[PDB]
Amino acid sequence: PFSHTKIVGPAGRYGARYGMGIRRKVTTIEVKQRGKHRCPSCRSLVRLERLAFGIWHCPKCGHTFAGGAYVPQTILGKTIAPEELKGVEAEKAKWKEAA
């Protein structure tokens, strides 16, 4: 399920150091961190750029925003997002009500 490794993929740079549990934690976080995400603005499946921890950038639409340390949106952060970017869902709700 990785390019050349079985289970230790992004953590393969660590070799046999630091312990299986530590490397597993790192792999679990990094597979989400370095995967593809839906941009909160343009909704594109893109590899967002993490400029620092908590600072994310979409290369498609140029949306720069604040998110999680290693993932663009945390579980709590999804529920308390700004209402400006949830315009599509509001339109869907009004369409389902009126139709």
Residue numbers belonging to the annotated binding site for Zn(2+) = 39, 42, 58, 61
- 15: tokens are 């070799």
Residue placing its CB nearer to Zn ion in the complex, 24 or 47: 47
Helix (H) or strand (E) holding 45: strand 45-46
With a CB cutoff of 8 Å and minimum separation 6, the contacts of 52 are: none
Binding RNA (rule: CB under 7 A), the pick from 13, 28, 34, 78 is 28
How far apart are the C-alpha atoms of 43 and 28, rounded to whole Å?
24
Residue placing its CB nearer to RNA in the complex, 49 or 89: 89
By CB under 7 A, name the binding residues for RNA.
17-19, 21-22, 24-25, 28, 69, 75, 96-97
